[PDB]
Tab-separated table of C-alpha atoms in Angstrom:
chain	number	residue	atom	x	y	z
A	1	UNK	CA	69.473	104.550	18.338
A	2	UNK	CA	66.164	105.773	17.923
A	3	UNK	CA	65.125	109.238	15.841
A	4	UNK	CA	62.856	111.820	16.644
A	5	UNK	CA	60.465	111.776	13.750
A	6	UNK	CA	56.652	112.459	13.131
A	7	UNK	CA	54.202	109.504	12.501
A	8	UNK	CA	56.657	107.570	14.748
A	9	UNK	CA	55.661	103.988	14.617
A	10	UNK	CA	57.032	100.412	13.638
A	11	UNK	CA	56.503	99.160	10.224
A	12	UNK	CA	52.240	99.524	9.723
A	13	UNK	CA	50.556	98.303	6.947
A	14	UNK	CA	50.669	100.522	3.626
A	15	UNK	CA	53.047	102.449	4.343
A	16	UNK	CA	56.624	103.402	1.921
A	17	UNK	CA	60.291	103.714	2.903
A	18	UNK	CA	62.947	104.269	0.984
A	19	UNK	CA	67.014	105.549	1.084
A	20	UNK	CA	69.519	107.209	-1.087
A	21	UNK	CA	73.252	106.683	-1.145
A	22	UNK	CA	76.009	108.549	-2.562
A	23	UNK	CA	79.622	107.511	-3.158
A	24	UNK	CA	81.175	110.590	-3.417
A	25	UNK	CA	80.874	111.427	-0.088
A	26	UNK	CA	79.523	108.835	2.427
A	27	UNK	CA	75.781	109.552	2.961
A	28	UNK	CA	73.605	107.104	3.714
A	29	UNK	CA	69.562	108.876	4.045
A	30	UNK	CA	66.327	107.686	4.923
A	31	UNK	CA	62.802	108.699	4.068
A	32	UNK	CA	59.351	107.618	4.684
A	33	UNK	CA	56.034	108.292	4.076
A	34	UNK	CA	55.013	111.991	4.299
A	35	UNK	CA	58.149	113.487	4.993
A	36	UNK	CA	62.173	111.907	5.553
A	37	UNK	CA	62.998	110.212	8.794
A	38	UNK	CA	65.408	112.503	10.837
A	39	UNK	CA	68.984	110.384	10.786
A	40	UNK	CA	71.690	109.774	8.378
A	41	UNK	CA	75.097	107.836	8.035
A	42	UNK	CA	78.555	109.045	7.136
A	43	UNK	CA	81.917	108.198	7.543
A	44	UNK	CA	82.584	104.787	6.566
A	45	UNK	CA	84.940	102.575	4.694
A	46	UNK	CA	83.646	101.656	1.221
A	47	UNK	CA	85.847	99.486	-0.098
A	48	UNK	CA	83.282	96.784	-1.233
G	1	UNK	CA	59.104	109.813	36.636
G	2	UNK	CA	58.152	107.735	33.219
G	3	UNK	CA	59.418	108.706	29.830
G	4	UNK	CA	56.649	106.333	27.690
G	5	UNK	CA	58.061	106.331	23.575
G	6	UNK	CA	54.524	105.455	22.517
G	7	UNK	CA	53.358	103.634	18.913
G	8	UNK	CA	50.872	104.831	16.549
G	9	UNK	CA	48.029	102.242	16.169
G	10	UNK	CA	44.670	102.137	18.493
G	11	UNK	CA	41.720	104.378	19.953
G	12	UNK	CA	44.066	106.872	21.659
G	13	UNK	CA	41.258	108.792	23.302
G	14	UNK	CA	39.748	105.911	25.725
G	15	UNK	CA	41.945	106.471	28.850
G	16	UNK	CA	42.340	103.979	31.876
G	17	UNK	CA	39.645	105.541	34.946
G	18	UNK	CA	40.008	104.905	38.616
G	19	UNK	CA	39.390	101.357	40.172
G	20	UNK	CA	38.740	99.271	37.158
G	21	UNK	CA	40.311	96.191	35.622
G	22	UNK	CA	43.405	96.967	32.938
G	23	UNK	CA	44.742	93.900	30.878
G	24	UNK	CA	48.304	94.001	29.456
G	25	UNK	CA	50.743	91.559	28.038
G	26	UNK	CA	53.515	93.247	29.268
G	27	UNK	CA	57.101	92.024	28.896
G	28	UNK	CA	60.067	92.983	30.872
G	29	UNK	CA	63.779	94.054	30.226
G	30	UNK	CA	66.748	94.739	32.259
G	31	UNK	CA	68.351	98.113	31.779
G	32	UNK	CA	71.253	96.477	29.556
G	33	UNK	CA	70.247	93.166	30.918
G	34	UNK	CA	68.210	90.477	29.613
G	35	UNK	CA	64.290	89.512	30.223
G	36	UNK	CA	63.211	88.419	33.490
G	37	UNK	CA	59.319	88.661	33.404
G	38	UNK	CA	56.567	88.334	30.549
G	39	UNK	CA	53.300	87.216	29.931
G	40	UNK	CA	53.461	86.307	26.081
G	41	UNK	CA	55.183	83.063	26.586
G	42	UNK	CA	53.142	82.334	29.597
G	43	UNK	CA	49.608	82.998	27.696
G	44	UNK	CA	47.949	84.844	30.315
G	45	UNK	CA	46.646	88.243	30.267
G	46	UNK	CA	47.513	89.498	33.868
G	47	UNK	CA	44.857	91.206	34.579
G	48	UNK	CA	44.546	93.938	37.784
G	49	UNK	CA	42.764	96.576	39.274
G	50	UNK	CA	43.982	100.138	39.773
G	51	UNK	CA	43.423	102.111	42.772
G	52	UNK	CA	43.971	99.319	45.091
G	53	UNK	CA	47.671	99.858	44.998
G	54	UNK	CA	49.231	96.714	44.654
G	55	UNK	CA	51.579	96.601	41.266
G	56	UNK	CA	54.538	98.706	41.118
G	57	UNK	CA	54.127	102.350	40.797
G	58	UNK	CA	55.915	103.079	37.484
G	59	UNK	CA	54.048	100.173	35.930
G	60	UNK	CA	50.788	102.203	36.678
G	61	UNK	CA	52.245	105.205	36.153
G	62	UNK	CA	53.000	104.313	32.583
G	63	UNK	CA	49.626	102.665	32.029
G	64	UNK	CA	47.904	105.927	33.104
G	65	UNK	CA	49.568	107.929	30.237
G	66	UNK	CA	48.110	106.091	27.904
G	67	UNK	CA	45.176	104.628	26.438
G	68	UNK	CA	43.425	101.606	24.718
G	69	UNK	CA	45.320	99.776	21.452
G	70	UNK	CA	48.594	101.711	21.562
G	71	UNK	CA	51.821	100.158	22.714
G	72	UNK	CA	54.509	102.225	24.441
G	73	UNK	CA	57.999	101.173	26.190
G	74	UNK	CA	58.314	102.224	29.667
G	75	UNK	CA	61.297	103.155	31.874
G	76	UNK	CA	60.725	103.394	35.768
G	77	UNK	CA	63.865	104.895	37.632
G	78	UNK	CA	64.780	102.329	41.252
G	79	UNK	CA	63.018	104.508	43.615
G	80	UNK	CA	60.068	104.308	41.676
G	81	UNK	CA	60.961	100.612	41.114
G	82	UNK	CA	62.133	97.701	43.249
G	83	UNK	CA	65.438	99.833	43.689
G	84	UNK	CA	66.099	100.557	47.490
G	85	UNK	CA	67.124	96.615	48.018
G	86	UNK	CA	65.360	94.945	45.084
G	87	UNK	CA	63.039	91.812	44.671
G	88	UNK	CA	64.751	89.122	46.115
G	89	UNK	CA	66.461	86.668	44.262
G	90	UNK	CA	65.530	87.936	40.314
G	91	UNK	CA	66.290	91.706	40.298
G	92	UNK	CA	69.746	92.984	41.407
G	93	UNK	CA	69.464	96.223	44.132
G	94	UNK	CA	69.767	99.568	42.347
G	95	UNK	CA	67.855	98.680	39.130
G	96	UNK	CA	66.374	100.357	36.454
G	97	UNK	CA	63.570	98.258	35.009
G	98	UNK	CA	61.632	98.514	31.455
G	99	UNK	CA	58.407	97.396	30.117
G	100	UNK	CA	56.534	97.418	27.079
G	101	UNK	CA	52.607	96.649	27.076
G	102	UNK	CA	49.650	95.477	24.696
G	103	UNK	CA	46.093	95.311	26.230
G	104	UNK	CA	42.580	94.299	25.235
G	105	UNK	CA	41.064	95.647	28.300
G	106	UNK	CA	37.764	96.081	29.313
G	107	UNK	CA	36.333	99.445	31.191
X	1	UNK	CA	78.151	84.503	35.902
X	2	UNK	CA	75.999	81.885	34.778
X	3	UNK	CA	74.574	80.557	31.679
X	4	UNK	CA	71.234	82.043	30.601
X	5	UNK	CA	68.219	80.482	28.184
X	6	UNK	CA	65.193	81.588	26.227
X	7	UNK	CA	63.342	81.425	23.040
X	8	UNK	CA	64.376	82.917	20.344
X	9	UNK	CA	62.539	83.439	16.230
X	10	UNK	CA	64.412	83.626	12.959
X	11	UNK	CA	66.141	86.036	11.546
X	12	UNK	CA	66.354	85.832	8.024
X	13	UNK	CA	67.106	88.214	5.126
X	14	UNK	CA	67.335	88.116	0.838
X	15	UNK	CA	68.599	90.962	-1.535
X	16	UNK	CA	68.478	91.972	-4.648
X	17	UNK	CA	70.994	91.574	-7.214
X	18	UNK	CA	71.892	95.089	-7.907
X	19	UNK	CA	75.752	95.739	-7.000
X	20	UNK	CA	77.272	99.093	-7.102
X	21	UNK	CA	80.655	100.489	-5.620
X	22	UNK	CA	83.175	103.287	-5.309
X	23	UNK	CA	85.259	102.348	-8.244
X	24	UNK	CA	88.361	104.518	-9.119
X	25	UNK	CA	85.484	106.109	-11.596
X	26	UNK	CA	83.456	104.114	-12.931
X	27	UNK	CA	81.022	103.927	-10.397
X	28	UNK	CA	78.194	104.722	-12.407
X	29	UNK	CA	77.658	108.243	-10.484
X	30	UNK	CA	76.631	106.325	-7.423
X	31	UNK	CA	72.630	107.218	-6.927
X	32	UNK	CA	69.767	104.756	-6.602
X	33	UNK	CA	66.624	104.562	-4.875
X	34	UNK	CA	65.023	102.130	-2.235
X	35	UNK	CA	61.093	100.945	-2.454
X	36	UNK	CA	59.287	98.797	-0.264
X	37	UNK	CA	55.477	97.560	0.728
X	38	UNK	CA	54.159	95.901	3.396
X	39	UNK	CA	50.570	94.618	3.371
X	40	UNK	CA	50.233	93.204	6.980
X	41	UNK	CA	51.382	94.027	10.803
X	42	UNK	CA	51.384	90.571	12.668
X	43	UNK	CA	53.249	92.324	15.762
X	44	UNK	CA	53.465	89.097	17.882
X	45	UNK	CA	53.148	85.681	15.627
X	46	UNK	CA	53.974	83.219	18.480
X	47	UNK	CA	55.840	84.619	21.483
X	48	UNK	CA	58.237	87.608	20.665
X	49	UNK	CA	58.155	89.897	17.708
């Protein structure tokens, strides 16, 4: 399932990624450096 | 013809030119399928000349829109490819072949 | 039809110790933050990835 994203690349030296979660609502984000990756998650069971 | 999904790191300016040696270390994949064909395992670099018409057309295709360093994965469509009956034995008729390539080539 | 072979790497994986959940509301608001480095790029070790 790849995303459309500037810089795109595999995993280079020096470089950050992160996420952010919320259990309110199921989203599931992802970021990079520079600027956030274009893809999410929703819609899952949570019960763990 | 060739949809390349190319990868950041290398010159990116230093383009293949006409009738001149291109190594690769190219790997194939069957479209939902399983590999067939690579050079990694076999340590060899594989290398050819272009012009003289001899390696598949997509292959070359792909390597054309490219240049030194970067890798890419390329999709070739069965006209393009083997695809009419297919090379005998390995790939089935009406395939749809991928690559993926890594080079140190000289110019 | 047939069985197929080929080599093959690890896959391996670790995690922190951090647990959350969706608790009926004590779920501690439910926001944290990922951070990682890498200080390399050895794209083919041996044979595959």
């Amino acid at each position: 399932r790849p995303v459309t994203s500037p810089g795109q690349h595999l995993l280079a030296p020096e470089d950050v990624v992160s996420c952010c979660l919320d259990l309110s609502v199921p989203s599931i984000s992802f970021r990079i450096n520079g600027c956030p990756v274009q893809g999410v998650f929703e819609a899952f069971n949570l019960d763990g | 013809g060739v949809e390349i999904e190319t990868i950041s790191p290398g010159d990116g300016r230093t383009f293949p030119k006409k009738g001149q040696t291109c190594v690769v270390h190219y790997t194939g994949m069957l479209q939902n399928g399983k590999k067939f064909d690579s050079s990694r395992d076999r340590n060899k670099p594989f290398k050819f000349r272009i012009g003289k018409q001899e390696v598949i057309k997509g292959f070359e295709e792909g390597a054309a829109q490219m240049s030194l360093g970067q890798r890419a994965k390329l999709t070739c469509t069965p006209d393009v490819a083997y695809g009419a009956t297919g090379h005998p034995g390995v790939i089935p008729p009406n395939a749809t072949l991928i690559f993926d390539v890594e080079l140190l080539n000289l110019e | 039809l047939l069985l197929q072979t080929n080599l093959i790497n690890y896959v391996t994986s670790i995690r922190p110790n951090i647990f959350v959940g969706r608790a009926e509301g004590s779920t501690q608001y439910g926001k944290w933050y990922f951070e990682v480095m890498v200080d390399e790029v050895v794209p083919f070790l041996t044979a595959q990835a």
